Write a protein that binds this ligand. Sequence first.
Ligand SMILES: C=C1/C(=C\C=C2/CCC[C@]3(C)[C@@H]([C@H](CC#CC(C)(C)O)CC#CC(O)(C(F)(F)F)C(F)(F)F)CC[C@@H]23)C[C@@H](O)C[C@@H]1O
Ligand SMILES: C=C1/C(=C\C=C2/CCC[C@]3(C)[C@@H]([C@H](CC#CC(C)(C)O)CC#CC(O)(C(F)(F)F)C(F)(F)F)CC[C@@H]23)C[C@@H](O)C[C@@H]1O
Lengths: 10, 10, 238, 238
Amino acid sequence: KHKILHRLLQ
Amino acid sequence: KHKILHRLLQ
Amino acid sequence: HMLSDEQMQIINSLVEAHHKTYDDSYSDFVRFRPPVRLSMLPHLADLVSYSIQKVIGFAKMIPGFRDLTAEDQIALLKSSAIEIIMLRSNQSFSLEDMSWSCGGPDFKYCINDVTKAGHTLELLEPLVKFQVGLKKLKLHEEEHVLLMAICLLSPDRPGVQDHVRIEALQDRLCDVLQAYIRIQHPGGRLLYAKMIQKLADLRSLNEEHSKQYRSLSFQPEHSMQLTPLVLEVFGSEV
Amino acid sequence: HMLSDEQMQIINSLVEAHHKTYDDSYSDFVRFRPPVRLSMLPHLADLVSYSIQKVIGFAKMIPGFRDLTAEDQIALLKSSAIEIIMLRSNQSFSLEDMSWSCGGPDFKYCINDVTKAGHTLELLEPLVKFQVGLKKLKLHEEEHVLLMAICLLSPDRPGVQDHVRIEALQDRLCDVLQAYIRIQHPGGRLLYAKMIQKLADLRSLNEEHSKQYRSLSFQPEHSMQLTPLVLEVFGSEV
Ligand SMILES: C=C1/C(=C\C=C2/CCC[C@]3(C)[C@@H]([C@H](CC#CC(C)(C)O)CC#CC(O)(C(F)(F)F)C(F)(F)F)CC[C@@H]23)C[C@@H](O)C[C@@H]1O
Ligand SMILES: C=C1/C(=C\C=C2/CCC[C@]3(C)[C@@H]([C@H](CC#CC(C)(C)O)CC#CC(O)(C(F)(F)F)C(F)(F)F)CC[C@@H]23)C[C@@H](O)C[C@@H]1O
């Protein structure tokens, strides 16, 4: 859940 | 699971 | 009567953050699926996706956002994304055309163009009405940026866990804004209030967007035209 | 020594089906995210997505595919999608350029352009080598179309349930092909065999693609550049 948001936020 | 494939196949 | 050294460095890092995530030439717009005049949906979904990326870039640079848990960073970005988009869009909105003019006759988005992306002219009137008002406030770059950071750090949101720490951050920002207007903005005695009212306005624009998006997202033939990021950010997953 | 009335109507509906799902002008290519020379990934993902749509359109018109359960229709389309794409691409591949030439200098895909979409030149050599061979077979439109329908209806696939009914359909098609070559193709005495060998070749190209796709699909920064349809068709979901 929210794999892209996580990557973008790091 | 496979919502688009299903729509496209109908 | 004077902004503190710390209120100043919050303005600095925020305007610099907006400068790094907002391109006034709108050069990247050529990398999107072209506009067609739901023919506008692929271009507009590409536009919203690219903007979510910039809102993420901006958010990451808001003092204190980075300190938050990954979860709260997500809860806030999911809920406020569309609102930050609508706020940041004002920088391109013109009163002389009643459209969002983005460096080109093909990247000029008028009401009729947004209609060919699934949406109904009846739900488009509050958006343009919100855009006329915002522009009429004739905000300084510092105030505009401050409004997006306050909007992003709003506590009243589904999924937010640390409702005390973000209310703290939003208040430290509201403080910078309120002091900025009084010191640096002549004739702004009722501006802070006029702007806070726009946050509430956005909440209503957000509901209406969520309803319209739900209509598109359930029809797989329309949902397929969206991007993975738009689907993720506007999706119901927790 | 002569094709039956029913073998003929299978050729007819299949060539008509290919005619309705394959545009030799490649007009729709302008609606994709532009090519950039992983800069090629958004254009190539848009290209593969559009082609999956056409493969679906084609599949639906293969006599008997429609009769199958929704599940088997999906199991077959998921597994064979990339193979049908590689087969159908031959119609655009040129021996004089060693590239896929699609009505324009911007829609001319050479080896180096496919490299800037995540892939490695080492895994690109079997594809172009497969494309040289296929073109060297100088297939009639009937044979080409028949090869895609036989490929799509292959029984040896993950997820297929009714392995007796599709083997039946594939054999009724293999029968139409084998008779077509003997009756209508001079000097084709060893063509049927040469073509069946290309189905096996494709299976190897498919493995190599699945491995390369897995690399991209796990990196969210690359996966985000894909489309919902590509993600769905190449995804592991059951
Ligand atoms: C991007 C910014 C600027 C433009 C923004 C404008 C003009 C074009 C239309 C936009 C993008 C609006 C739409 C339309 C909305 C509507 C109502 C009914 C008000 O809810 C939002 C969306 C959407 C989608 O439903 C999905 F799925 F969510 F994507 C889509 F329709 F599917 F796409 C809001 C802001 C608008 C350009 C420039 O200022 C950059 C800036 O970041
Ligand atoms: C479309 C057809 C024609 C062109 C097709 C050609 C040339 C360009 C490159 C293509 C599209 C190949 C790639 C590359 C592959 C490679 C190896 C290592 C062989 O596995 C397949 C893909 C992919 C993706 O990994 C994903 F995710 F899966 F999408 C992407 F890289 F991400 F995109 C196969 C067929 C090729 C044009 C015209 O003939 C129409 C026809 O339908």
